[PDB]
Every structure is written in C-alpha cells, then in structure tokens.
Structure 1
Amino acid sequence: TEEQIAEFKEAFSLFDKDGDGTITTKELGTVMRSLGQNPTEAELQDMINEVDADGNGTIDFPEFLTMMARKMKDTDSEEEIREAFRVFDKDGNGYISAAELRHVMTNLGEKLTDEEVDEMIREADIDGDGQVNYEEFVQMMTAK
C-alpha cells in the first residue's frame, strides 16, 4: 500500500497546504470553498467531529489513513442504504419507479443536477413499466 499511502499523504498536503500535519475547520473550509460550493461552518464542525477521534479539534494524519483505508463496501452500509431506499419505496415492494426517484434525488436533501438524475435513471435498466428494483442498485454500490 506504499503507493496508496503516498497518494494519501499527497492529498493531505494538498488539503492542509502546510507542514502542520493537521487540518482545522477553517483549513478544510477554505479548500472546500475553493471548488465553489459555499459550505456552512456548522457542517464543517460536524465533519471534523466525524473524522477526528482524539477530540483535539483537528485531524491527525494517522486518523486520516485509518478512516481512509476503510473501504465503503460494508454490510452495515448495505443495510443502511437498503433501508434508505425503502423509506421511499411505497408499499415496501422493493421496486421504485423512475419518476418519484428522480424527484427525490433532485429535490430532497442536497439537490442533484438534472443531468445527474438522468445519469441515475439510465444507469440501470429502466424497462419493466418504469419500476426498477433498488436491490440491484444496492448490490452495485456494494461492488464498488
């Protein structure tokens, strides 16, 4: 994982942009804003809380690599995403139509771009009266 560790250290350097070895709330916020996304301080605080485990108010690189190396694909994630899909699955039949799914994706929560929603519907076979099983999606996300 030497190449992986090198890439992670390079990304950490890009984030902090200094030898401190730590990224504060403002340090993360500035780099996030540079992409043109208009964050909010509250979610920066929540984010640094959710990454940092020592409770010192900043992220140490050992924790950076610790919660990097962890891959997204997990059974916990499997069931969490399955239930998140279920909350929108009327009748709990395991099938979601390509109409309400687009609306919830574009509108609810962090609104998604219409092109992205088209990408979502075209990602899987919409055939079958427009009802697609979200289980195939959950498995695809699991694959990673």
Structure 2
Amino acid sequence: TEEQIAEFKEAFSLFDKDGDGTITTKELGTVMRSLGQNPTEAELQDMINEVDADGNGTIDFPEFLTMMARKMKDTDSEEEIREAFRVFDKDGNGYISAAELRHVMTNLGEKLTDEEVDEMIREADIDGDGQVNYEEFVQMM
C-alpha cells in the first residue's frame, strides 16, 4: 500500500546520505557504524550484493522495498514461533522439558503419558541434552 511504502522510504532515506536514490557500500558502512558495528568493505559489498538484484553495484528503493518485505515476513514469523516457545517453556529458562510439554499437551486436550512425551522430546532433541531448544522447536514446526 501507499502508507507501508512511505515507512520504508524513511529507512531508505537514512541510508542514502546523498539523496541520489540508491544506497552504496560506503553509505551502508556509515549507518552500520552508527549502530556500533564494524564492518569491513568485504562484508559491506556482500550486504549490498544480497539486495542489489539488477547488479549495478548499489541498492535502489524498489530493491530495498522487495527486501524489506521479505524481512517483514521473516520477522513476524520468527516472533510468532518465539511466542509459542515461551508458552511451552514455563520457567522461561530457554528449554522445554517433558513435564512442560505434557502440561501444555494436556491443556491442548491431549493426555499423554511421560513415555509418550519423552519420545516427543527425543524426536526434536538433536543435541541429546534431554529437552528441546529453540532452533529445534523452530525446526520441528
């Protein structure tokens, strides 16, 4: 929509120091260093390349818009998976145990045994710690 675009155009403007309608490796360098980040010229060219679809060596507003729109979908998606994880994790210690899973399953209408739930933890527990971490949760969804 019109309103959504004018929001991304402000962020775009922040990068485009010169107001010429593109973001350059050096301009992106200036912003990233405002945020306390290094970065090398090599790393900078890579960030540009990942967004510069026409391949003329800078980023234009349409490329910026297309990128930001996919990031916008990744952000929301990440924050929804994160919220579900926090609900399964009762003590908020960063790990979902068997008792926590069984307790949530029970509320979801599924009365499982500890054997059954220990099997579900084992199914997602890649690292074998005995409980489910965040990436495993994201991967298991």
Name the TM-score, length of structure 1 as normaliser.
0.54
1:75–1:16 Cα change, 3 Å? closer
Deviations 1:61-89 (A, max 9, x none): 11111222225657999999999999999
8 Å CA contact retained: 1:89, 1:96? yes
Q: How many residue pairs get matched? A: 141
Q: Distance in 2 between matches of 1:105 and 1:37?
A: 43
Q: Which has the higher contact order (CA 8 A, sep 6+)?
A: 1
Name the TM-score, length of structure 2 as normaliser.
0.55
Superposition misfits of 4+ residues, deviation over 3 angstroms:
71-130, 133-137
Q: Distance in 2 between matches of 1:111 and 1:43?
A: 51
Considering fraction of residues, name the structure with more strand: 1
8 Å CA contact retained: 1:97, 1:131? yes
Deviation at 1:24, TM superposition (A): 0.6
Query: Mean alpha-carbon deviation: is it higher for 95-104 or for 45-54?
Result: 95-104
1:91–1:36 Cα change, 3 Å? closer
Query: Mean alpha-carbon deviation: is it higher for 97-106 or for 49-58?
Result: 97-106
1:83–1:5 Cα change, 3 Å? closer
8 Å CA contact retained: 1:94, 1:135? no
Identity over aligned pairs, percent: 100
1:65–1:122 Cα change, 3 Å? farther
Deviation at 1:136, TM superposition (A): 6.8
Q: Name stretches of at least 5 consecutive residues in structure 1 with no aligned partner.
A: none
Deviations 1:7-56 (A, max 9, x none): 10011011112320101100100110111111111111111111101110
Query: Mean alpha-carbon deviation: is it higher for 48-57 or for 66-75?
Result: 66-75
1:128–1:38 Cα change, 3 Å? closer
Q: Which has the larger radius of gyration?
A: 2
8 Å CA contact retained: 1:23, 1:58? yes
8 Å CA contact retained: 1:53, 1:63? yes
